[PDB]
Amino acid sequence: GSSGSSGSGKKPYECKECRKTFIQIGHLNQHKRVHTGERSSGPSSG
Numbered sequence: 852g853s854s855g856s857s858g859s860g861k862k863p864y865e866c867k868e869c870r871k872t873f874i875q876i877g878h879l880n881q882h883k884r885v886h887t888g889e890r891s892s893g894p895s896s897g
């Protein structure tokens with residue numbers, strides 16, 4: 852099951868939704884906001 856190639860060294864930041872990292876705080880400062888809402892839009896949805 853679990854698996855992961857070699858790498859993924861100490862990462863900078865880490866989102867909460869897409870759990871994505873960011874080299875610079877600026878790129879995240881804006882992204883973080885992008886996660887305003889649009890939640891629970893998977894099942895029984897388009």
Ligand SMILES: [Zn+2]
Pocket residue numbers: 866867868869870871882883886
């Ligand atoms: Zn995100």
